[PDB]
Structure 1
């Protein structure tokens, strides 16, 4: 399934993932496409900062959902 990760600069990127993939896996994909180290990524969905060890289905992230990407200060 496809999900979207949006920056606050209005850029949206598309990732191919399965519900079983971890947040850490998503961060790795983001590092590959955008060069941002995973330790600097905060992903946000449903008002929560997403923990690395959980899966997308653990957060009820589904096809075409959007996650927010912010950098850590």
Structure 2
């Protein structure tokens, strides 16, 4: 499926993913397009910060949902 990621400068990133993807794999996919290591990433959805170790399904994140990327230090 396809989901989107918005940056705090307004950039929109596209991502092919599956619901069983852990948040770790989603961030690895953002790393490949944006060069941000996963440990410097916060992904926000529906007013929550997603947890590494959980999956897209655990947050009921469905197709065409938009995430929000925020950078962090570690």
TM-score band by shorter chain is: over 0.9
Give, in whole Å, the separation in 2 of the partners of 1:29 and 1:53: 15
- 1:72 CA displacement: 1.1
Matched residue, 2:25:
25
Q: What whole-Å deviation, never above 9, does each CA across 1:7-45 have from its counterpart, x for those lacking one?
A: 011101110001110100000001111100111100001
* Structure 2 residue ranges without an equivalent (≥5): none
Query: What SS does the aligned partner of 1:58 have?
Result: coil
TM-score between both structures, scaled by the size of structure 1: 0.95
RMSD of Structure 2 on Structure 1 (CA): 0.8
How far, CA to CA, are the matches of 1:19 and 1:8 in structure 2?
A: 25
How far does residue 62 in structure 1 lie from its aligned partner after superposition?
Answer: 0.6
Paired residue for 1:67? Answer: 67
Which structure 1 residue ranges, 5 or more long, are not aligned? none
Runs of 4+ in 1 over 3 A off after TM superposition: none
